[PDB]
């Protein structure tokens, strides 16, 4: 499915991230289609959260421990370690280029997709290529982030 947030026709009208404390019902959409997309995607470079106000919660599926199809977020964070930024130009009209973000690994006091808080490490390439999503966006380097 992939997570098809929107642009131009939307009214993000720059958006950024708004934190996570609570859950909604699109946010399970943000969890199981940042599965269909953290794994169907790493790519092209998607711009995690846009249509009106937001939420984030990230995901994993048994990828740093011997989880399940599990989640990640970027929350109410801890630690941040490294930085790196990806060479893409992304959201709101995805032209020209940029490395926007500046993240290695980031562990999270966060809440997944029930209402439940939780706390632990976002590493990998996804983790860094979903918050890029994201942080092409609230990570803004960049200029305009075409936004
Ligand atoms: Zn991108």
Same mark, same amino acid.
């Given at each position: 499915? %992939?997570?098809?947030?929107?642009?131009?026709?939307?009214?993000?009208?720059?958006?950024?991230? #708004? &934190?996570?404390?609570?859950?909604?019902? $699109?946010?399970q959409?943000?969890?199981?289609?940042?599965?269909?997309?953290?794994?169907?995607? $790493? @790519?092209? @470079?998607?711009?995690?959260?846009?249509?009106?106000?937001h939420?984030?919660?990230?995901?994993?599926?048994?990828?740093?421990?011997?989880?399940?199809?599990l989640?990640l977020?970027? &929350?109410?964070?801890?630690?941040?370690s490294? *930085?790196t930024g990806? *060479? $893409? =130009?992304?959201?709101?009209?995805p032209?020209?280029?940029?490395? %926007?973000?500046?993240?290695?690994?980031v #562990?999270?006091?966060?809440?997944?997709?029930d =209402?439940? &808080?939780?706390?632990?490490?976002?590493?990998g390439?996804?983790?860094?290529?979903?918050?890029?999503?994201?942080?092409?966006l %609230? =990570?803004?380097?960049?200029?305009?982030?075409?936004?």
């Amino acid at each position: 499915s %992939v997570l098809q947030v929107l642009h131009i026709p939307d009214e993000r009208l720059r958006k950024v991230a #708004k &934190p996570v404390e609570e859950v909604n019902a $699109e946010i399970q959409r943000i969890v199981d289609d940042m599965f269909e997309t953290m794994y169907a995607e $790493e @790519g092209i @470079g998607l711009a995690a959260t846009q249509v009106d106000i937001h939420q984030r919660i990230i995901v994993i599926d048994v990828s740093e421990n011997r989880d399940e199809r599990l989640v990640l977020i970027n &929350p109410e964070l801890l630690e941040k370690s490294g *930085e790196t930024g990806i *060479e $893409e =130009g992304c959201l709101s009209i995805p032209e020209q280029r940029a490395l %926007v973000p500046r993240a290695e690994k980031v #562990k999270i006091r966060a809440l997944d997709r029930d =209402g439940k &808080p939780f706390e632990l490490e976002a590493d990998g390439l996804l983790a860094i290529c979903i918050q890029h999503e994201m942080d092409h966006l %609230v =990570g803004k380097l960049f200029m305009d982030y075409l936004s």
